C-alpha cells in the first residue's frame, strides 16, 4: 500500500538525473551559477547519486570555492568511492586550500583507480 507508493516515490527520483543533465548543459556553456541550482534541486530529490555533488563541486572549482568543492567531493566519494573524478577534483580543491598531503593522496588514489 504505502510501501509500494514509496517505491514509486523512489523511481520518480529521475528528476535528479534530468536536473543533472540540465546542470551539465549549463556547465558546458560556462553558466555555472545555474548549473549549481540544477545540481542542488537534483540533490534535494536523491540523495544518493555521486554525480550531483561531484559536478556541483566541479562548478564550485570553476567559480573559485574549493571549500564547497572539497565538501561536495567528500560527499560524492562517500556515495561512490570508485569515482576517480571526485578524488581528482578534491585533490585540486585541497591543492588550492593548501592541503597538499591529502591532495597528493587523492591524486595517487586517482592514479590507483585509473591505471
Amino acid at each position: 500500500e504505502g510501501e509500494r507508493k514509496q517505491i514509486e516515490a523512489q523511481q520518480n527520483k529521475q528528476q535528479a538525473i534530468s536536473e543533472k543533465d540540465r546542470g551539465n548543459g549549463f556547465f558546458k556553456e560556462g553558466k555555472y551559477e545555474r548549473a549549481i541550482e540544477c545540481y542542488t534541486r537534483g540533490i534535494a530529490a536523491d540523495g544518493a547519486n555521486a554525480l550531483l555533488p561531484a559536478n556541483r563541486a566541479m562548478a564550485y572549482l570553476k567559480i573559485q570555492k574549493y571549500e564547497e568543492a572539497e565538501k561536495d567531493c567528500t560527499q560524492a566519494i562517500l556515495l561512490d568511492g570508485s569515482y576517480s573524478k571526485a578524488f581528482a577534483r578534491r585533490g585540486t580543491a585541497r591543492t588550492f586550500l593548501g592541503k597538499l598531503n591529502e591532495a597528493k593522496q587523492d591524486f595517487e588514489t586517482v592514479l590507483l583507480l585509473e591505471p
Partner: peptide, 7 residues
C-alpha cells in the same frame, strides 16, 4: 581536462 569533463 578529462577530470574537467562532466558525466
Amino acid at each position: 581536462s578529462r577530470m574537467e569533463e562532466v558525466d
